[PDB]
């Protein structure tokens, strides 16, 4: 960071300032399964939603709740909880049993404590893929693999939502990823030194990766079903930015004096396929682009300056398409033929999990245009 | 110090420093209508030099300095030909000779097809005379849109402010490793001399009064600057004919594109660009509309630790005394913005408000 002041822009490593794991990659690593007991309100309800909103009882436990202050919050793992905890709870209260029946004003107790959490991490008070996704998370067994059957999530909103199935099939995908995030400054630095197979073998390295992902999105079909994802889940990730339930937004009492507009948890809030496009020069920053670009706010802030550091760095697509160099072109179309792939096979997971199920009782059009600039990408058709 | 990638200038900071003034003489036609938009507007002749221009390739603009020029010369070009007159008459299609070469050079250079406060603030500039120095009596702009629309004064006392807050980046470096190598003093000496060159900006901004007129910016300058974002105007946006299909919205020349201004909010952990407010998405935008190596400054200042946030963990009056200084002088020249704003728009309109008290309630809200 103060060296890139200096010599400019160059990755040739990747820092440790920018919060990403070796193993995990963008997912916080060996989140904390447990908070002070100083905060056991909180913990009771967030652990116990399902019942709480059920039984009519949860937006009296939140009323009924003490400001509890962020101070015994040490360190940051601890705050990201919390963040989750309280993120969780915020959704159940807003949303209640999830049939109309909203709550346009938080309670000062949880609101306070939530801006003030939300503000120490650059966040904004509403959950967000880094909470429910990245640090909702636990190993059952710390020696066995980080594999669905060794993993548990650490919060749900409703019995039989399909919670653990979506979020921890989310988390091993951003995990599958990862691996190629170590092989980016393998090609900045190839790009620079002008080393032609190393640039290859680190492209084809991406690409395997993100082949490998592709294997593992197939196991959203074995723990999540079409309909509790819409009837259910989808009402407690919706937000508050546009939406006719809540058309100025949520009043954050004793924080805010207007209420405030917020978008809702959003898979568009992923820092590794955001800076796949970056890498690639996959231009995806109209709507596709403005939301896009508006969901690297709801990212940690170290993953917003990584993001933004890739953009900095040199094009690898007009290194690539410089260099007349048809293995090289190979290599990186093996990249974007993958990114292709993963959007298209997401594109068929939404007609069955929100298209269909909509029709028994747009983001179609955002996930086309996305696709479709990541197809338009290729130099040579797929 | 800050390194050459960055593009910022010891003396001018984020000013083109030395801009080229001629074009090569392949590009005569551009430069001819460039040089003489107030008479070509005045009389109507401007649309149809343009519509009878022949499609010159950007090829020949070798340098960074000349691709520079020629954005500012197509973009003052294609402002003139979008308002006309400036009084309804608007055109949605841009013409393919001018569009073309336009959106090409725009791609090279990472900018949109608008005319951005780089073109007509940061490289529409010259020195009457080299050896007099950087003030404006001996100063002037390259490019005008009527006459008496108060272009130079607009233009220059912005550039002069530029320059005048640029003394304070060369203390940046500065201010980070005293940090992290924990040097209090340095630091706060530091901290002191960027609140020194803030206090010394906001003496230059006072000669606006002397060069801007309230009627003649209200009534014609404000025109030529306006864009096709969000505009009942061009309520689709604009055809850039031969590069794209559809219409396509820019926002106009904005002072949200300095790029000296953002990064004090960001080295003093303002968090301007957060809060999902009308405020900080716009400036979030504006980072698109900066010069890439500039916005590239931005981002690197934001990777780097929080000042801010080292201030309030050391328990240090003298330090937060300090840092305190520089965030009373970006309120004092937020202030005296606001006063501006009220003279030169606010009052004229009644013969963006709330965006600039949004931004300054947030400079003051900073204060320890
Ligand atoms: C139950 C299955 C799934 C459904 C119904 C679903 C639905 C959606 C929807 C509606 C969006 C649009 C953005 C928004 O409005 O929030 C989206 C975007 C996205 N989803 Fe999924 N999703 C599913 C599984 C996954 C999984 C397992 C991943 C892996 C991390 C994933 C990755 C993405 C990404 C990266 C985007 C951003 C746009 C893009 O870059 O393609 N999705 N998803
Ligand atoms: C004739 C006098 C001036 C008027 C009427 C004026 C007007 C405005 C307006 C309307 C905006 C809002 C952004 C937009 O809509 O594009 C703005 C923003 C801004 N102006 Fe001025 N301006 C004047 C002089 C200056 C000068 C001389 C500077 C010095 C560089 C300056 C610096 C700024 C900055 C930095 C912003 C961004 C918001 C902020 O950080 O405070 N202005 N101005
Ligand atoms: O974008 C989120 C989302 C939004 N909808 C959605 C469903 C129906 C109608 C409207 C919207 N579904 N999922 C989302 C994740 C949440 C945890 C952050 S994880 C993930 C992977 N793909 C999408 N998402
Ligand atoms: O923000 C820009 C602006 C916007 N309006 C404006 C006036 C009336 C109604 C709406 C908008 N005026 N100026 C601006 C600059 C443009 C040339 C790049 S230079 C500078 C210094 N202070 C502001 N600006």
């Not at 609101?111 to 650059?122: F, G, M, W």
């Not at 596709?288 to 990212?299: E, G, K, P, S």
């Amino acid at each position: 960071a103060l060296e890139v002041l200096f010599q400019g822009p160059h990755m040739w490593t990747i820092s440790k300032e920018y919060h990403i794991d070796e193993e995990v990659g963008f997912a916080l690593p060996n989140p904390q399964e447990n908070l002070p007991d100083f905060y056991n309100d909180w913990m009771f309800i967030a652990k116990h939603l399902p019942d709480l909103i059920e039984s009519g009882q949860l937006r009296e436990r939140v009323e009924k709740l003490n400001m509890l202050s962020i101070d015994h919050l040490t360190d940051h793992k601890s705050q990201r909880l919390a963040r989750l905890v309280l993120g969780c709870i915020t959704m159940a209260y807003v949303w209640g049993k999830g049939h109309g029946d909203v709550r346009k004003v938080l309670p000062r107790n949880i609101a306070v404590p939530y801006c003030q959490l939300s503000k120490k991490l650059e966040l904004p008070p509403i959950l967000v893929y880094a909470d429910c996704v990245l640090a909702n998370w636990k190993k059952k067994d710390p020696n066995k693999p980080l594999t669905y059957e060794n993993m548990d999530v650490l919060f749900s909103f409703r019995d039989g939502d399909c919670s653990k199935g979506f979020f921890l099939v989310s988390l091993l995908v951003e995990i599958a990823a990862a691996s190629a995030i170590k092989v980016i400054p393998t090609v900045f630095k190839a790009m620079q030194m002008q080393e032609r197979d190393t640039l290859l073998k680190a492209l084809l390295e991406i690409a395997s990766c993100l082949e490998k992902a592709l294997q593992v999105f197939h196991q959203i079909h074995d723990h999540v079903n079409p309909k509790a994802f819409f009837s259910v889940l989808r009402i407690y990730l919706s937000g508050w930015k546009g939406n006719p339930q809540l058309s100025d937004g949520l009043v954050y009492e004793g924080f805010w004096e207007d209420p405030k507009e917020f978008a809702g948890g959003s898979a568009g809030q992923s820092s590794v396929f955001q800076c796949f496009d970056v890498l690639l020069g996959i231009q995806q920053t109209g709507h596709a682009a403005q939301f896009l670009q508006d969901m690297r706010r709801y990212m940690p802030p170290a993953h917003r300056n990584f993001l933004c550091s890739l953009e900095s760095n040199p094009s690898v697509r007009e290194f690539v398409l410089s260099k007349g160099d048809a293995g090289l072109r190979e290599a990186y179309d093996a990249c974007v033929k993958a990114l292709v792939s993963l959007r298209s096979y997401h594109l068929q997971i939404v007609t069955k999990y929100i298209l269909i199920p909509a029709s028994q009782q747009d983001l179609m059009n955002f996930l086309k245009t996305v696709r479709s600039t990541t197809e338009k990408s290729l130099l040579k058709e797929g």
